[PDB]
C-alpha cells in the first residue's frame, strides 16, 4: 500500500529524547585484535541479541549494575552481551561486545538510576564463563575475525585485461535507466574472464558485493523515499551489519546470521530473507497474521526496526509499520516516555492468545502525518514464508543462503 511519509522528523527517535537531559558523551573508542583472548563482564538481564553497529539504550537500577558501570566509565567503557539461544537455561555460545558512548546518573526521587547509550562493535565466540562473589560474571572470550575475500575474478583474471578493470567516471547518475545500461556493461567487463571457468557471468554476479548492495538499496528505497546513497555506508561489512540490524527476525535466525563470517554470505542471506518472508504472524500463535512487508516503512534514520528502552529497563526491538490487524487495544493512549515525540501509545494484544504484540501510536496534533502507526516488538513476531506455489511443494521456517 501507498500512504504518506511527510511531516514528523526521522531524526527524533535516533536521539532517544525520552531519556532526558543531554548525557556525558565519550569519543575515545576501543577495538581488540582478531582472534585475541579477552576477559569481559556480562550484563545479566540483557535478553537482546546485539548486532555490531546497533544502538542500544539501557536504564539500570540494580546497585551491582551501577557499580560495574561506574568502574567501566573510567576504563575502556566496554562490556559483553550474550546471545541467549535458550533463555530458560541461560545458554549462550556466541555474543557481541558493546561500547558505552553516553552516560548519565540520577539520584532523583530516592532511587539510584543510571542511563546509558551503547553501540555494538565486535562479534565473539564464548570460551569460558566464571562468576565472581559480587554477582557480576566474567567471560573469557575469543574475538571472531571478519573474513573478507578478493573478487572472484582475481584468480582467473587475464593479465592483458587487468588494465581498464577500473570503470570510467565511477558512479552512475543515480537514474536506474542509465544504471541498467551501466550494470550490463559492468557485468560484461568485470566478469569477462568468467568464460574461462565452469560457470557463467550471471552466477558470479550473485556473489559480488556491489550487485548485492545495489539490490539491497532497491529494496530499502521501497520502504522509505527519504533515502540518499550517502546515508548508507559504502563498506560492505558495515553495510551488511547495518542491514541485518533492522531486519525483523526470530532469535534462532538472528543467531545463525551472526555466526556468518563473510560479508558476502551475510548480504546473500539478507536478500534471500527479504524476498522470502512476505508475512509476519504472531510468534505465540504462529497462525495469526499480523502484517506484511508491504506495510513496512522507515520512521527513523537507521531503518524500520530498532531497539528502544522503556521506563523499567526492558529493551524492545520495535518495528514501525503502517497497518496491522487481529489486535485488541488495552488501556487508553498515553505519551508517557514515548519513543516517538508527538505520538501517544496504546498496548496491543493478540485477539486470540492475548499475547502482547506492541503498541499503537496515535498523533497528538491533527496536522501530523501519518496520524497513526504501529510499533511491533520483534520478540513477539514470527516471519512467515508465503504458502501456496501450487501447494504441491510446501516448506518450513528456515534461513536460506
Amino acid at each position: 500500500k501507498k500512504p504518506n511519509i511527510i511531516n514528523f522528523d526521522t531524526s527524533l527517535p535516533t536521539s532517544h529524547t525520552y531519556l532526558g537531559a543531554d548525557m556525558e558523551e565519550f569519543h575515545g573508542r576501543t577495538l581488540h585484535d582478531d582472534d585475541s583472548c579477552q576477559v569481559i563482564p556480562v550484563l545479566p538481564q540483557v535478553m537482546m541479541i546485539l548486532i555490531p553497529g546497533q544502538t542500544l539504550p539501557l536504564q539500570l537500577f540494580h546497585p551491582q549494575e551501577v557499580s560495574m558501570v561506574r568502574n567501566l566509565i573510567q576504563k575502556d567503557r566496554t562490556f559483553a552481551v550474550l546471545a541467549y539461544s535458550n533463555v530458560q537455561e541461560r545458554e549462550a555460545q556466541f555474543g557481541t561486545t558493546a561500547e558505552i558512548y553516553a552516560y548519565r546518573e540520577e539520584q532523583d526521587f530516592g532511587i539510584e538510576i543510571v542511563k546509558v547509550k551503547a553501540i555494538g562493535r565486535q562479534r565473539f565466540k564464548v570460551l569460558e564463563l566464571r562468576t565472581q562473589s559480587d554477582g557480576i560474571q566474567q567471560a573469557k572470550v575469543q574475538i571472531l575475525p571478519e573474513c573478507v575475500l578478493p573478487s572472484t575474478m582475481s584468480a582467473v583474471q587475464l593479465e592483458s585485461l587487468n588494465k581498464c578493470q577500473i570503470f570510467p567516471s565511477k558512479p552512475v547518475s543515480r537514474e536506474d535507466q542509465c544504471s541498467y545500461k551501466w550494470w550490463q556493461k559492468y557485468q560484461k567487463r568485470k566478469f569477462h574472464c568468467a568464460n574461462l571457468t565452469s560457470w557463467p557471468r550471471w552466477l558470479y554476479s550473485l556473489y559480488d558485493a556491489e550487485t548485492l548492495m545495489d539490490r539491497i538499496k532497491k529494496q530499502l528505497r521501497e520502504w522509505d523515499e527519504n533515502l540518499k546513497d550517502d546515508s548508507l555506508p559504502s563498506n560492505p561489512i558495515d553495510f551488511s551489519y547495518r542491514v541485518a540490524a533492522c531486519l525483523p527476525i526470530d532469535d534462532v535466525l538472528r543467531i545463525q546470521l551472526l555466526k556468518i563470517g563473510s560479508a558476502i554470505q551475510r548480504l546473500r542471506c539478507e536478500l534471500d530473507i527479504m524476498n522470502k518472508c512476505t508475512s509476519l504472524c504472531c510468534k505465540q500463535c504462529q497462525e495469526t497474521e499480523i502484517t506484511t512487508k508491504n506495510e513496512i516503512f522507515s520512521l527513523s534514520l537507521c531503518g524500520p526496526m530498532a531497539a528502544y528502552v522503556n521506563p523499567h529497563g526492558y529493551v524492545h526491538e520495535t518495528l514501525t509499520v503502517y497497518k496491522a490487524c487481529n489486535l485488541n487495544l488495552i488501556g487508553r493512549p498515553s505519551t508517557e516516555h514515548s519513543w516517538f515525540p508527538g505520538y501517544a501509545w496504546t498496548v496491543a494484544q493478540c485477539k486470540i492468545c492475548a499475547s502482547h504484540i506492541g503498541w499503537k501510536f496515535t498523533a497528538t496534533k491533527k496536522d501530523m502525518s501519518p496520524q497513526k502507526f504501529w510499533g511491533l516488538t520483534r520478540s513477539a513476531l514470527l516471519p512467515t514464508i508465503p504458502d501456496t506455489e501450487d501447494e504441491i511443494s510446501p516448506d518450513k521456517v528456515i534461513l536460506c543462503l
Partner: peptide, 30 residues
C-alpha cells in the same frame, strides 16, 4: 483508592490482582 495495575514489560494495564500475573506469565514463557 487501589489504582490500576500495569505490567513492567509492556505497560499492559489491568485491574484484579492475579490477572496481570496471568498476563506476565505469557511474556517470558516461550
Amino acid at each position: 483508592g487501589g489504582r490500576p495495575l500495569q505490567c513492567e514489560i509492556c505497560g499492559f494495564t489491568c485491574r484484579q490482582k492475579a490477572s496481570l500475573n496471568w498476563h506476565q506469565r505469557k511474556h517470558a514463557e516461550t
